[PDB]
Amino acid sequence: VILPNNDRHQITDTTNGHYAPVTYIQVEATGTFIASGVVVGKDTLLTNKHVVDATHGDPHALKAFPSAINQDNYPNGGFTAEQITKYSGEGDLAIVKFSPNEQNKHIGEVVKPATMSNNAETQVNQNITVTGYPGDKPVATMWESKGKITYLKGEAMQYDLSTTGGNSGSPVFNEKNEVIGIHWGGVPNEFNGAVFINENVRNFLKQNIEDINFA
Ligand SMILES: [Zn+2]
């Protein structure tokens, strides 16, 4: 949701630096559901349970476009999901595995997977960014939203930065450009939040993704 702190910048050079694995998602149902996500392995991407539920039991309905720049401008093309594993906890988190594309390339090869933080030093009041694809902006455009962490408890985190429908599943980056959480949404006039990747979540990811990298 939009908050008093609405500080967002468009990322045009999407394949530069830590932005490459930030991904645009389209789920074809009924209508087209839009969301975001982040590549964290050779064939794996993280997003929310609710974006994955938009496929209504059909993984093939989910397409990921890493580093998408704008409508029909996908520098790495797209990838179709083949298998989905939802987080067993309360956290709105899901793991999506993709099959290679027509050129036999893997989603985690055309782009360098993001580095996951161990979150040892993460704390309230730290400056972070949530980068993904807001639906109030031009189609398939990547935007970085700036703010501070305002709440940390268990596997949940909240922050004061703005997001909009479409940002579902956007990675939360700390200053070191490591993924510390996965954005799920927010509450009007209150806050936006994400699944905080603590020890429990980390162990879950490690058990389901053999090549995920934690700093
Ligand atoms: Zn700014």
Side-chain angles (χ1 to χ4, degrees), residues 4 6 17-18 22 27 34 38 48 60 73 84 91 113 125 129 147 149 170 185 187 207 213:
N6 188 177
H18 72 288
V22 177
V27 178
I34 53 163
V38 59
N48 302 316
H60 294 350
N73 196 176
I84 301 166
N125 286 321
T129 56
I149 297 171
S170 298
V187 180
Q207 206 186 69
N213 189 54

Side-chain angles (χ1 to χ4, degrees), residues 5-9 144-146:
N5 166 32
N6 188 177
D7 181 355
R8 307 186 280 164
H9 301 236
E144 176 179 88
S145 179
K146 303 146 62 180

Side-chain angles (χ1 to χ4, degrees), residues 86-97:
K86 293 186 268 193
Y87 176 46
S88 60
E90 288 300 306
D92 196 350
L93 174 65
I95 301 173
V96 186
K97 191 191 169 190

Side-chain angles (χ1 to χ4, degrees), residues 35-101 103-116:
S36 312
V38 59
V39 175
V40 297
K42 176 182 180 181
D43 289 287
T44 57
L45 159 308
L46 304 178
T47 186
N48 302 316
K49 278 179 191 173
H50 73 263
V51 334
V52 143
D53 289 331
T55 62
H56 296 103
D58 178 20
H60 294 350
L62 193 158
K63 290 203 197 304
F65 306 88
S67 336
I69 305 162
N70 60 73
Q71 191 161 22
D72 304 323
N73 196 176
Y74 315 127
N76 299 298
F79 298 75
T80 300
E82 69 166 351
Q83 199 245 293
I84 301 166
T85 299
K86 293 186 268 193
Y87 176 46
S88 60
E90 288 300 306
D92 196 350
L93 174 65
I95 301 173
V96 186
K97 191 191 169 190
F98 293 80
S99 49
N101 61 14
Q103 284 305 298
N104 295 295
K105 299 295 198 306
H106 295 266
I107 195 168
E109 293 177 347
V110 301
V111 162
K112 188 203 174 216
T115 298
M116 308 298 295

Side-chain angles (χ1 to χ4, degrees), residues 137-150:
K137 299 298 190 186
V139 178
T141 52
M142 188 196 288
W143 294 73
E144 176 179 88
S145 179
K146 303 146 62 180
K148 289 172 165 297
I149 297 171
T150 53

